[PDB]
Paper text:
Given both H35 and H61 are strictly conserved, we made LpdD H35A and H61A variants to test for the effect of an intact metal-binding site on prFMNH2 binding. The H61A variant crystallized in the same space group and conditions as the WT LpdD, and superposed with the Mn2+-bound WT LpdD monomer (0.24 Å rmsd). The loop region spanning residues 55 to 62 was disordered for both monomers in the AU. Residual electron density was present located next to H35 and D63 that was assigned to a weakly bound Mn2+. When tested using whole-cell decarboxylation assays, both variants displayed reduced activity when compared with WT LpdD whole-cell assays, with H35A more affected than H61A. In vitro reconstitution of the purified H61A variant reveals this mutation does not abolish prFMNH2 binding, whereas the purified H35A variant did not bind prFMNH2 under the conditions used. This suggests that His35—and by extension metal binding—is more important for LpdD function in vivo compared with H61, although neither are essential under the conditions tested. While mutagenesis of either H35 or H61 affects metal binding and, in the case of H35, prFMNH2 binding in vitro, both variants retain residual activity when assayed in E. coli whole-cell context.
Previous studies indicated that the small protein LpdD (lp_0272) is associated with the UbiD-type gallate decarboxylase LpdC (lp_2945) in Lactobacillus plantarum. The crystal structure of the purified LpdD reveals a dimeric protein with structural similarity to the eukaryotic heterodimeric proteasome assembly chaperone Pba3/4. Solution studies demonstrate that LpdD protein specifically binds to reduced prFMN species only. The addition of the LpdD–prFMNH2 complex supports reconstitution and activation of the purified E. coli apo-UbiD in vitro, leading to modest 3,4-dihydroxybenzoic acid decarboxylation. These observations suggest that LpdD acts as a prFMNH2-binding chaperone, enabling apo-UbiD activation through enhanced prFMNH2 incorporation and subsequent oxidative maturation.
Numbering used by the authors:
A (entry chain A): -1 to 55, 62 to 121
B (entry chain B): -1 to 55, 64 to 121
Write the structure that this text describes.
Amino acid sequence: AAMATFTTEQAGYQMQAILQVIGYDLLIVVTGGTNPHIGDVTTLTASTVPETVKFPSKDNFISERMAKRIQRYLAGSCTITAGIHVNQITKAQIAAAAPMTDDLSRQIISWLQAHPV
Amino acid sequence: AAMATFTTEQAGYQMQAILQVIGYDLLIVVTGGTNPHIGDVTTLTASTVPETVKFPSNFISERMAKRIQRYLAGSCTITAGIHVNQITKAQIAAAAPMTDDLSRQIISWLQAHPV
Ligand SMILES: [Mn+2]
């Protein structure tokens, strides 16, 4: 109804998006790999450029990529947290972050289309 | 071979996509109606997030880019500008299916003529 979980796994590790709808607004928690955390927070609306806070620890490539993918479908505000970490991550797994972020975005968008906010 | 033209017509007005291949890259020009123009431009590769520019007084170039993004071997630049004088609501509603129709046409051609 107002909450949903999306997963994807490529190159041998999983990333996950937990979506929460509050009124007309979105909260999306993106984690993955061995040690999930909150490394970056991206805020936006459909009309505004996304801003990112980076906490002390490039997780924002994920939170901002997702934001750009879904910006056109936002009925209100959107907050996206990202914290993916893979131990001894490989170049392949690093390359898989963008396709995986796109995959979660497409599930999210398709969810929003089935569940108009 | 390096250029192709696709058309569609629904609700009594036509849209056309002219495709040009330059190296591995694509230029696609979408026009339609009585007054073709360039009102929005979408750029993308298979692996970047498409970016749309809107010129002042944008769904078509953006919508086509998302349709075809996975089939791209290089860069893609899609211009779009359709205009119908006294456009009707059903003609508005027809722009999306016509965009999809051109997209399926374009995907078919790309697979038959692998860049
Ligand atoms: Mn981090």
